[PDB]
Each structure stands twice: as C-alpha cells, then as structure tokens.
Amino acid sequence: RDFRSADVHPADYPTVEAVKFMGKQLAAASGGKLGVKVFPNGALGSEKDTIEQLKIGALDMMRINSSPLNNFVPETVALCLPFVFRDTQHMRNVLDGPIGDEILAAMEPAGLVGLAYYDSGARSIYTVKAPVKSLADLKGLKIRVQQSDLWVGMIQSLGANPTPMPYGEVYTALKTGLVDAAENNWPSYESSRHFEAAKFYNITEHSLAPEVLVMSKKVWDTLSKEDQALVRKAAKDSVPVMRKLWDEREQASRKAVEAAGVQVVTVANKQEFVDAMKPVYQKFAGDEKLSSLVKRIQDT
Ligand SMILES: O=C(O)[C@H]1O[C@H](O)[C@H](O)[C@@H](O)[C@H]1O
C-alpha cells in the first residue's frame, strides 16, 4: 500500500526528497507492505486543496506549510508568529521535542494526523519596485500572504495591505502588478522564479513558520497500531535528512539568485518590526491554549 503524498514544490526540492526518503525507510521497515509515492509540482492541488482532500480521505498525505493550517488547527498559529523563534536551532529544539509532538497531535480534531516537521528557514519580504530598508517603506504596499487569518493580520500590522493567495498564483501576480511584494525563504524565492519578478530580497526574517508532513486521519485509522508506529518513525527519520539538504539548498539558492542580479537588502533596525508585529500575539494567540504554547516555546 503506497500512501499518495502531495507537495507544491519541484521533484528535486528538499521537502520532496525527504518524503522519498521516508518512503524508502517505510518500505524496508514494513517488508514492502507500506510505502509513499510523492506527487510534486502541486499536481494534486494547492495546499488548501490538499488539506480539503485529506479531510475527506481523498488524499493520504501532504507536505505543506503550517500557515495554511492556521485557520483549521489554531495551535499551529504558535509556530507561525513573528519573532517567536530566535533562530533555527531554537526552532529545531522546539519542534523535535514535546511541544512539536503536541501540536502535531492537535491536528486530529481537524481530521488530520501530524507526522513530522520540516524546516522552512526564515521568511523575508521581496519587492518588485524598490528596496525595503525600514518599516516605513512597507506602508501601503500590496503584499501576497498565505491563506491564513494570522498572516493577514501580520501584514496589516506592518502598515501594508495583504492579499491571500495560493503559492502557485504568486509569480504571475508579481509580474502583472496584482501585488507589489511577497515573502518567503531563499529556496522558495529561487525555485518559484519569484526572484525574476521581484529583484529586491529584503532580509526581514519575520517568520520561521515550519513545514508539516500530515496524514489523513481517515487513512491513519485504517492502519494497525504497529503500522502507525512505523509510519511515524519513518517520518521522524526523514527530518534530519531534510535538514542536511535544506541547509545546503539555502546557500545554493542564495548564490544562484545573487548571480542572476538580485539585490540583497539589509533592514538595519529589526526591533521596529518586532514592536510593530507584536500585537498579533494577543489578537491571534491570546486564548488559554495558544498563550500557553507560546510561553513554552519562548522558554525553550
Ligand atoms: O508561501 C507559500 O505558499 C509557500 O512557501 C514555502 O515555499 C513553503 O515551503 C510552501 O509549502 C508554501 O507554504
């Protein structure tokens, strides 16, 4: 039995290679009983589409960002907040530990079973027309965001105007002037070709929202207890493999887009951004559940 697993990214991308590795491990560990087959390039739909398919049992697995789950699984908000993670190592400690496992389990009420997290670096704003040197340069800018209430709030808090849309629609939106900007990590900015539409990469590092690898709960529940354990272990084993590929890809991608003429822009005073964005903590992570998760993250 091969689980069909979706990804928006190309076949060579670290998140796709990681799930392929999970598939190899799972096939071996299960003596051929279980496996994974990956469907890259967004063939099976946008990330929101694949959430819908998992919910109804029409798709077995997806590798998506945690952000489009914000509206479905409130606990994922804690991972996506601005400046909630100090750095990569902080994030990895949190996600690998009990807090990460708790948020994966909290998906079950939505008909989803979280299996593992993959890294997504830090997201930064890239613009078409001009550099962003400070908070003021974002005023009134049309900035694409993922389909998340939190993210709409995050961009509004920067004095800019959010347009939620699926990843695959972003390139043409930048090229045709529908939006002025979007935001993402280095490998996405490269692989999407957004760097060819928006040549200013302004290092804001305003979120470290990670990826999640998720199974349809309906499919999960057809598995034996023992098969479930194998599936989890294969998924977890693929995380360090993903990270080795990812950290290398961040460097390769930055080098490539600089070679293509991208202007890498420094924002001198990030504290401006931290203070501007802080209100979303109470607006979106202010209830008992979320505020507790946020505290425990900060304390790691
Ligand atoms: O901005 C987006 O939609 C995308 O950002 C990253 O590329 C992430 O890896 C994708 O899963 C998706 O979330």
Side-chain angles (χ1 to χ4, degrees), residues 31-285:
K33 183 185 183 185
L34 306 167
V36 185
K37 177 162 164 208
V38 185
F39 293 86
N41 296 303
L44 303 188
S46 72
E47 301 205 326
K48 186 171 154 74
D49 291 324
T50 59
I51 292 164
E52 300 173 13
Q53 289 178 43
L54 259 71
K55 284 180 79 79
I56 66 174
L59 177 59
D60 303 311
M61 284 170 59
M62 67 189 175
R63 197 297 310 158
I64 63 167
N65 192 252
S66 53
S67 301
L69 283 179
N70 290 161
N71 299 342
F72 294 96
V73 183
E75 288 90 345
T76 61
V77 165
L79 306 180
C80 298
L81 288 163
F83 306 104
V84 73
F85 293 117
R86 293 175 295 271
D87 53 50
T88 303
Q89 191 52 59
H90 177 204
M91 189 193 69
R92 294 181 175 172
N93 292 347
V94 168
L95 300 179
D96 286 347
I99 302 171
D101 287 336
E102 280 177 32
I103 293 182
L104 294 174
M107 297 185 182
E108 291 211 13
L112 305 172
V113 178
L115 301 176
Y117 296 95
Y118 295 148
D119 284 42
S120 203
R123 301 176 72 95
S124 291
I125 297 171
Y126 39 95
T127 44
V128 175
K129 162 203 69 193
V132 176
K133 308 288 192 73
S134 69
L135 187 53
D137 298 320
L138 296 176
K139 182 60 174 113
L141 236 51
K142 291 178 298 298
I143 306 177
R144 176 272 176 171
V145 293
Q146 291 175 93
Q147 296 152 104
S148 157
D149 289 352
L150 168 70
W151 273 96
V152 167
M154 281 164 67
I155 291 318
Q156 285 167 351
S157 81
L158 293 169
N161 303 115
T163 295
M165 89 188 49
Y167 186 59
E169 295 180 0
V170 180
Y171 177 88
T172 195
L174 291 167
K175 264 304 191 190
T176 63
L178 185 58
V179 297
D180 300 310
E183 47 78 53
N184 223 312
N185 57 47
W186 285 104
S188 297
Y189 174 64
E190 185 253 312
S191 65
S192 68
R193 311 310 293 193
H194 293 171
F195 73 99
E196 296 191 284
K199 69 186 168 180
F200 301 95
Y201 192 84
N202 314 284
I203 302 173
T204 54
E205 300 176 302
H206 54 262
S207 178
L208 274 66
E211 322 297 13
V212 289
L213 183 66
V214 186
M215 181 172 281
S216 165
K217 189 174 149 56
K218 180 172 162 296
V219 174
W220 174 261
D221 286 340
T222 69
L223 302 175
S224 73
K225 188 179 176 193
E226 295 77 31
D227 287 346
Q228 288 174 340
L230 290 192
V231 165
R232 285 192 190 283
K233 177 59 158 52
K236 290 301 191 67
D237 285 352
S238 75
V239 173
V241 170
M242 187 273 167
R243 285 168 180 167
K244 284 165 192 173
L245 297 176
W246 180 255
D247 292 342
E248 300 307 309
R249 184 61 183 261
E250 290 184 313
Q251 185 181 7
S253 289
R254 176 175 173 157
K255 184 198 296 183
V257 302
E258 288 201 66
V262 164
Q263 307 300 119
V264 183
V265 180
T266 297
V267 313
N269 188 20
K270 282 192 193 55
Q271 194 61 44
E272 239 185 5
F273 285 70
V274 178
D275 293 334
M277 295 184 88
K278 202 63 175 53
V280 304
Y281 278 61
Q282 216 63 316
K283 293 184 186 307
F284 293 94

Side-chain angles (χ1 to χ4, degrees), residues 2-41:
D2 283 343
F3 303 115
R4 300 169 69 259
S5 195
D7 201 311
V8 292
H9 288 306
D12 58 274
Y13 200 78
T15 55
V16 172
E17 292 291 357
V19 175
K20 285 182 178 178
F21 177 89
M22 169 188 176
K24 284 185 183 298
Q25 295 298 96
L26 179 59
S30 74
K33 183 185 183 185
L34 306 167
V36 185
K37 177 162 164 208
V38 185
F39 293 86
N41 296 303

